[PDB]
Design a protein around this ligand. Sequence first.
Ligand SMILES: CCCCCCCCCCC[C@@H](O)CC(=O)N[C@H]1[C@@H](OP(=O)(O)O)O[C@H](CO)[C@@H](O)[C@@H]1OC(=O)C[C@H](O)CCCCCCCCCCC
Ligand SMILES: CCCCCCCCCCC[C@@H](O)CC(=O)N[C@H]1[C@@H](OP(=O)(O)O)O[C@H](CO)[C@@H](O)[C@@H]1OC(=O)C[C@H](O)CCCCCCCCCCC
Ligand SMILES: *[C@@H]1O[C@H](CO)[C@@H](O[C@@H]2O[C@H](CO)[C@@H](O)[C@H](O)[C@H]2NC(C)=O)[C@H](O)[C@H]1NC(C)=O
Ligand SMILES: *[C@@H]1O[C@H](CO)[C@@H](O[C@@H]2O[C@H](CO)[C@@H](O)[C@H](O)[C@H]2NC(C)=O)[C@H](O)[C@H]1NC(C)=O
Ligand SMILES: *[C@@H]1O[C@H](CO)[C@@H](O[C@H]2O[C@H](CO)[C@@H](O)[C@H](O)[C@H]2NC(C)=O)[C@H](O)[C@H]1NC(C)=O
Ligand SMILES: *[C@@H]1O[C@H](CO)[C@@H](O[C@H]2O[C@H](CO)[C@@H](O)[C@H](O)[C@H]2NC(C)=O)[C@H](O)[C@H]1NC(C)=O
Ligand SMILES: *[C@@H]1O[C@H](CO)[C@@H](O[C@H]2O[C@H](CO)[C@@H](O)[C@H](O)[C@H]2NC(C)=O)[C@H](O)[C@H]1NC(C)=O
Ligand SMILES: *[C@H]1O[C@H](CO)[C@@H](O[C@@H]2O[C@H](CO)[C@@H](O)[C@H](O)[C@H]2NC(C)=O)[C@H](O)[C@H]1NC(C)=O
Ligand SMILES: *[C@H]1O[C@H](CO)[C@@H](O[C@H]2O[C@H](CO)[C@@H](O)[C@H](O)[C@H]2NC(C)=O)[C@H](O)[C@H]1NC(C)=O
Ligand SMILES: *[C@@H]1O[C@H](CO)[C@@H](O)[C@H](O)[C@H]1NC(C)=O
Ligand SMILES: *[C@@H]1O[C@H](CO)[C@@H](O)[C@H](O)[C@H]1NC(C)=O
Ligand SMILES: *[C@@H]1O[C@H](CO)[C@@H](O)[C@H](O)[C@H]1NC(C)=O
Ligand SMILES: *[C@@H]1O[C@H](CO)[C@@H](O)[C@H](O)[C@H]1NC(C)=O
Ligand SMILES: *[C@H]1O[C@H](CO)[C@@H](O)[C@H](O)[C@H]1NC(C)=O
Lengths: 592, 590, 137, 137
Amino acid sequence: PCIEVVPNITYQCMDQKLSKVPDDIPSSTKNIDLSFNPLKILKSYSFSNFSELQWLDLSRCEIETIEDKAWHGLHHLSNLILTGNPIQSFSPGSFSGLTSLENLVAVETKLASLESFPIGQLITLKKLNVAHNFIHSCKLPAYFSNLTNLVHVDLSYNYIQTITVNDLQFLRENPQVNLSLDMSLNPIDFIQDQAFQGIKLHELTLRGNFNSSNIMKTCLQNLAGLHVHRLILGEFKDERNLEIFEPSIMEGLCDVTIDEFRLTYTNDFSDDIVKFHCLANVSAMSLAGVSIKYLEDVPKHFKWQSLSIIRCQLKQFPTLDLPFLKSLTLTMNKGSISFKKVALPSLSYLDLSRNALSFSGCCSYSDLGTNSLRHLDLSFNGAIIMSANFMGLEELQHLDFQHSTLKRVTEFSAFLSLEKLLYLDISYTNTKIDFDGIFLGLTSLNTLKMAGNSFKDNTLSNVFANTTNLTFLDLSKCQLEQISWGVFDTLHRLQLLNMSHNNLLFLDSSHYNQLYSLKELALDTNQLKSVPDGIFDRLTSLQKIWLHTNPWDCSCPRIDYLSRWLNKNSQKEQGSAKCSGSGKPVRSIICP
Amino acid sequence: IEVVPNITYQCMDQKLSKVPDDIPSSTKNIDLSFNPLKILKSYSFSNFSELQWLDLSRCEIETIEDKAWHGLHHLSNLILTGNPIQSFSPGSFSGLTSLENLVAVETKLASLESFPIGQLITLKKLNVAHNFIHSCKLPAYFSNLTNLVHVDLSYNYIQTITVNDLQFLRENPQVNLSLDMSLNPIDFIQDQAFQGIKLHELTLRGNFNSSNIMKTCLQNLAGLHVHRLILGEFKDERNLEIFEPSIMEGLCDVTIDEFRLTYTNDFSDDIVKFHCLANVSAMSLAGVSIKYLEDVPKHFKWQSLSIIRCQLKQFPTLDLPFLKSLTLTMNKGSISFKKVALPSLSYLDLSRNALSFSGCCSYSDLGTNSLRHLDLSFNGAIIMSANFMGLEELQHLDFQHSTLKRVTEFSAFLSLEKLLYLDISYTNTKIDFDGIFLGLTSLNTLKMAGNSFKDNTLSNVFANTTNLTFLDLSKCQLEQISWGVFDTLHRLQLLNMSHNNLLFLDSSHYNQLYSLKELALDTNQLKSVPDGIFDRLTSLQKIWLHTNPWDCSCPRIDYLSRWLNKNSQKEQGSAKCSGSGKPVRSIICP
Amino acid sequence: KQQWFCNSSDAIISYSYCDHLKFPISISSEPCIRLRGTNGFVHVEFIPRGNLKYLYFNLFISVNSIELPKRKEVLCHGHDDDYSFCRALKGETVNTSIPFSFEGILFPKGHYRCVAEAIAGDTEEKLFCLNFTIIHR
Amino acid sequence: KQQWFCNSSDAIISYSYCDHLKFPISISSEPCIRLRGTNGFVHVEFIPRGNLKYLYFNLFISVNSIELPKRKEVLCHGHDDDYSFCRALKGETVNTSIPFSFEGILFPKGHYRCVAEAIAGDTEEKLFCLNFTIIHR
Ligand SMILES: CCCCCCCCCCC[C@@H](O)CC(=O)N[C@H]1[C@@H](OP(=O)(O)O)O[C@H](CO)[C@@H](O)[C@@H]1OC(=O)C[C@H](O)CCCCCCCCCCC
Ligand SMILES: CCCCCCCCCCC[C@@H](O)CC(=O)N[C@H]1[C@@H](OP(=O)(O)O)O[C@H](CO)[C@@H](O)[C@@H]1OC(=O)C[C@H](O)CCCCCCCCCCC
Ligand SMILES: *[C@@H]1O[C@H](CO)[C@@H](O[C@@H]2O[C@H](CO)[C@@H](O)[C@H](O)[C@H]2NC(C)=O)[C@H](O)[C@H]1NC(C)=O
Ligand SMILES: *[C@@H]1O[C@H](CO)[C@@H](O[C@@H]2O[C@H](CO)[C@@H](O)[C@H](O)[C@H]2NC(C)=O)[C@H](O)[C@H]1NC(C)=O
Ligand SMILES: *[C@@H]1O[C@H](CO)[C@@H](O[C@H]2O[C@H](CO)[C@@H](O)[C@H](O)[C@H]2NC(C)=O)[C@H](O)[C@H]1NC(C)=O
Ligand SMILES: *[C@@H]1O[C@H](CO)[C@@H](O[C@H]2O[C@H](CO)[C@@H](O)[C@H](O)[C@H]2NC(C)=O)[C@H](O)[C@H]1NC(C)=O
Ligand SMILES: *[C@@H]1O[C@H](CO)[C@@H](O[C@H]2O[C@H](CO)[C@@H](O)[C@H](O)[C@H]2NC(C)=O)[C@H](O)[C@H]1NC(C)=O
Ligand SMILES: *[C@H]1O[C@H](CO)[C@@H](O[C@@H]2O[C@H](CO)[C@@H](O)[C@H](O)[C@H]2NC(C)=O)[C@H](O)[C@H]1NC(C)=O
Ligand SMILES: *[C@H]1O[C@H](CO)[C@@H](O[C@H]2O[C@H](CO)[C@@H](O)[C@H](O)[C@H]2NC(C)=O)[C@H](O)[C@H]1NC(C)=O
Ligand SMILES: *[C@@H]1O[C@H](CO)[C@@H](O)[C@H](O)[C@H]1NC(C)=O
Ligand SMILES: *[C@@H]1O[C@H](CO)[C@@H](O)[C@H](O)[C@H]1NC(C)=O
Ligand SMILES: *[C@@H]1O[C@H](CO)[C@@H](O)[C@H](O)[C@H]1NC(C)=O
Ligand SMILES: *[C@@H]1O[C@H](CO)[C@@H](O)[C@H](O)[C@H]1NC(C)=O
Ligand SMILES: *[C@H]1O[C@H](CO)[C@@H](O)[C@H](O)[C@H]1NC(C)=O
């Protein structure tokens, strides 16, 4: 029984209609997955001779009783997953011997409270998950004093309706305790005054708690005092959403102290919420799944240092003059918006990917208003028209255009001023390289990804002549039929060359003479019938080579160098080169 | 230099003393331009009688001596431009029995009054631009020339227009005439001078130095009826500093079917919303720095609007409920499409704007059910998301060179049952889905060059596209063709599969193509052909097989060398043998 | 082996389990889907064989034998997602019902298939696989 | 050969006629072009060997011997054109100063060549052809 995953190491007994734990398992096993077996009960010393288990998963095991002493041989076990088990009685120290336990997951374990929960010995704990249970107390037992390393707790989907100054009575005792709390999906109506006074919370998640405005409004006023790092706030498309939602509802956040705010989906939304006055002193404003439609007039004093808009619904591209902003991220937009000028002189990181965004007259200082941009991701978008070669942006190390429709890139040296650029991806941009100076300027370039494109006369021309420090080059799917002389003569630091998925008919030994530091060469799935003798002999750093899916002609004496060569080097060949007609491997063939 | 055998000759810049005797007596066009001549001799070419078109531009001529134009009994076009032949005595226009078009540009001429073209009743077009004329005055001999419909008065010294100048037109409201006043420094038009006059089109471009002067001059067009009026200026000329819309008032005393604005150094979006334009039937901007065009008043009686080479920053909003035709083309920007509501709209042209367009296309985009022509060529990303619910009257759809997205993800032309013509060439569409053209059952003309197919296999997409007479699959990287692919296309008259990478043909595709006239297969990678392949190509008129590496081994090249030799009149270009170079026509298997 | 059906102004939806993945789940619309346009709810009841943190779908649709290319559809992106069920862990109870709303495209008439493999992004392990059948008028 | 020349704060421009097309023109700029940026006039006096109704240009540019793809620039589209001279006819004297204006993109330094065939898209013949030489510093 059981599956074979990483033998004597990870196994999968999931859903093996098992009576109980099988001994027919290597003792060295470090990963078991018994979930979905009618075990019903955990007869003790069950996990005794599986002595170096790390990851135990007993989800949906129908278990009613932990006959304690069950976890004895497991000094080093970290993950224990008991989800969906009808355990009523967690009889004290039931978690016996689990000395190295970091992560405890007792979701839907029919649990009434932490009071009745025998976990005070497990100092090693960090994560505790008691979501989906029968809990009503926000309060944290006094034995957390003992659990030094506990850093996060998850009470979402319980029955907590109320938060008192006592529920929290404990964080006050140790305001040098880093804890994070998730209370999403708890039908909360009451937090009392001063409940959240002098409290130290890292991540507090309040999602889908409130049934209507007034409850939230008021519950929120009564967080006052709290210093929090990350407050996550919103509701859910599949639950009861506040029919109405006005910014007023976050009065008193102005008493709550936040560095990262994070708004999620909400039935009713108001563009005025992100302008809302109580968020001015966040250092990481952030939106997700939100139906915000415009984003203009964000007051200039605001101290947002990163902003991030994700899966939202902008109709038009933000107007932003925020001078303290270091990272903008607008991504997966519903729209097809079109880029508009900005002025964020503090900006260093711009990810505008996946918006079907359209960008006319890219790219220079004028467009952005910083001289310290290092990362421009314009990938998965629409028509990017290159009318400007990055004058002003010369601090850049990451340019991604992949899968967008770049236009005019071959009409001048469009990347001329990008002398510090380390990574360029123009793969899949429907670009046809008509011009050999396409890449002038890019003297620092390491990674060049330019698959899925094409070349004048299907010829790989001399476009790399001074992209000398190139270490990764992808020319896969570029319809190449051949390669002009000289092209690679300078790429001495090149390590990976991919020229697979092309239509090459021959190769020429005049290319590989100087790829001194090259370790990887894909030439698979072209149309080579053959290779010149000795072609690979000067590739002194070589490790892997792909050559399959070419119709190699195995007539001797022709196929001799290569057969011999691959046989000697079989270790390096990835996949398997084969003969036209016969279908036999190439390393197999022996000439007289 | 004869270009057409014995029927047109080009003698331009030949340092020629005078006309050559040498040249044939049949020649129908002749060009002696840029030759020193100085005198158009008497009877100078009596022999060249079967002559339609004569051009003597910049021939350095100073004298038309008497009866130079004999015989010339059929000459329609005559071009004397740039010759200093200053004085034309009642002895220069002899016997142009059939002259339609006379061109005296830069001939130093100073007046029409004394200009000797009196009984050339045939005349359709006179052009006297770039001369010394100081007077608008339209001679009375014009009564004798009832054929004349167009006079070019451009680049002359005219400052004034006076009621007697245009008297002739008052006493001839049956005459249909057109005037080009452009590049004259007109500062005064006398009151009532355009009362009871009709012009077909009048061109007033680059006339005015000063805002006020234009305003007053335009004032005194009052009462004019003009089919097409053309206004504005040029960039290589002294422009108007200010151009306030009010400078147009008193166009509402003139009557205009078609108004046409051109470049204007200074321009105001609200100039095209002027009230004195509301009754124009065809509004048209061209070369203008218009940036918005939004709140156009619904009473405006515009039936056609053409914006060309302008600078819109945003796609116009429009509710003009009698607009039948909208052309927005060559826009400076990239702009993105916004919905409109044009219920009279039947012809939309939005080509060449780098236009992007989320959620193409359906009724709610446009607000018409009568759209017969949609042209979205040469634009940006067009995101196909509806399939033309509401637009089912479409007969012509053009997507050429735009980047068409999602078109392979559903049947996106499903509702276009009336569609005759589809261009999806160079849209870089990679055809994944055989139902892509479902719905297009009326379709004749399918252009889809420069795309590609999954597995480079032409698959079965023409199953129900059955009235195709014209299919272009050139440049689609094809390597092979699925089996039944062409079996439905009983009406097909042209099939292009050139510039592809086919290595073999299968004969089953091409039998049954009985209706086919043209078949291009050149510039593939073919070496051979199934014996028989072309036999039932009964209607065939033209075949291209060249630029393929044909193997002229015998007995292999037998069928074809024979066939192509027998059908040598239909072969376009020449199918040559690999190695040698020898036409396949000419091989003879033993 | 149907596990459901429903009729409507145009559509006759229905689904069985996939021959190769029978893992249980139960699921229903409200109303029955009109392809012309529809607002409603999707009732889903089942207990997953893996975490739904990165839930997504693979749809293998086909009209009258014409395969559409594999369509992918993400539900849980694994960050601040819009659905409660995204937090579901392996072998947890899931009852929710999900609102949906759409105006129709003109779909060709006839016999549609669609297998919907659900998949857990974190592991690419298939969670389940339905096999719908839609007939349209 | 040198028909004209001028040098500016970053460029040194000059032209000749094209080896196999000598038809005359005298053209110049005021000011001399600075590649970094320039407002000025192109003065042009010549006699068209053709109608200018569809005047356009083919620019065969080449930076330090690297050829750019042929570039095409229409001046007269033959319809409501922006310039006086599109109206000019073969033979007619032409004299004009054409305003122009630009902001420099970054140009690599060195030796440019630009041959500029002028063409009359009515007959498609050649009007004239200059061979420029820009030397950027
Ligand atoms: C021939 C093969 C067809 C295969 C069909 C599947 C693929 C169809 C893809 C076309 C639709 C898609 O590209 C665009 C879309 O999604 N549009 C919705 C969007 O419309 P916009 O106008 O773009 O705002 O948002 C609008 C507002 O929300 C909304 O009105 C639009 O909704 C649509 O048009 C979606 C379609 O109508 C699809 C309907 C899905 C039917 C569900 C069947 C379920 C059967 C059971 C299987 C699990
Ligand atoms: C390796 C390089 C060799 C190739 C060089 C030639 C090709 C260069 C093409 C790049 C620019 C072009 O794609 C876009 C353009 O046209 N920009 C003008 C436009 O700018 P926006 O981006 O729209 O604001 O509109 C602006 C407002 O009018 C205007 O300022 C912008 O100006 C430019 O970008 C033009 C460039 O600076 C090019 C300058 C031409 C220099 C003239 C040479 C003189 C000698 C002539 C010899 C024939
Ligand atoms: C408090 O707790 C968290 C969680 O242990 C600490 O870790 C950072 O935050 C996230 C949790 O959301 C971790 O997963 C990251 O690895 C940590 N940050 C980064 C950038 O990796 C957090 O540092 C703790 N706070 C303090 C002051 O110790
Ligand atoms: C068939 O297709 C080709 C390629 O699209 C047509 O165009 C020929 O090749 C180039 C590329 O388009 C054009 O510039 C030429 O003008 C065309 N050839 C010639 C000889 O002029 C070709 O015309 C098409 N032929 C038919 C009959 O439709
Ligand atoms: C070289 O390029 C090929 C093609 O891009 C790479 O293969 C990858 O992309 C394929 C596209 O056909 C996909 O099938 C795969 O996701 C992936 N290949 C595999 C086996 O998974 C290939 O990774 C590249 N080779 C390298 C980097 O050595
Ligand atoms: C007046 O004469 C003009 C010039 O011949 C006629 O021609 C114009 O109008 C026609 C259609 O109405 C066009 O087909 C012609 O090409 C067009 N020519 C020009 C230069 O515009 C015109 O028809 C006559 N007037 C009317 C009202 O019909
Ligand atoms: C999904 O359901 C269809 C319908 O039962 C399965 O295909 C079967 O039905 C075909 C016509 O619809 C029959 O002709 C076939 O015999 C039968 N399929 C096979 C392989 O025999 C389909 O296989 C089901 N889903 C899967 C495989 O995921
Ligand atoms: C314009 O002039 C340049 C030189 O300034 C020409 O360049 C010469 O090209 C020909 C090729 O036949 C050679 O004779 C010379 O060696 C070249 N000289 C240099 C310095 O490169 C160019 O050919 C001219 N324009 C044309 C031919 O249109
Ligand atoms: C934002 O939080 C800051 C954090 O200290 C608060 O104080 C700042 O903003 C005040 C608004 O006028 C200024 O008076 C102070 O200069 C500044 N004070 C400090 C100590 O930094 C402020 O209460 C919060 N602002 C809002 C609008 O809620
Ligand atoms: C436009 O037409 C209406 C109705 O004929 C009329 O009241 C008005 O004078 C006209 N305006 C003009 C021609 O400017
Ligand atoms: C096209 O004809 C076939 C065979 O008659 C049919 O099955 C197919 O579905 C038709 N096209 C449609 C419905 O769009
Ligand atoms: C799921 O929700 C509906 C709402 O009434 C209910 O009928 C169904 O039985 C619910 N829950 C369970 C556990 O069955
Ligand atoms: C052409 O125009 C310039 C501009 O002032 C002038 O100096 C020059 O002499 C003119 N040439 C002729 C022949 O008029
Ligand atoms: C690459 O070109 C640069 C800049 O044009 C030039 O200096 C050099 O000749 C080339 N690189 C090298 C290493 O020679």
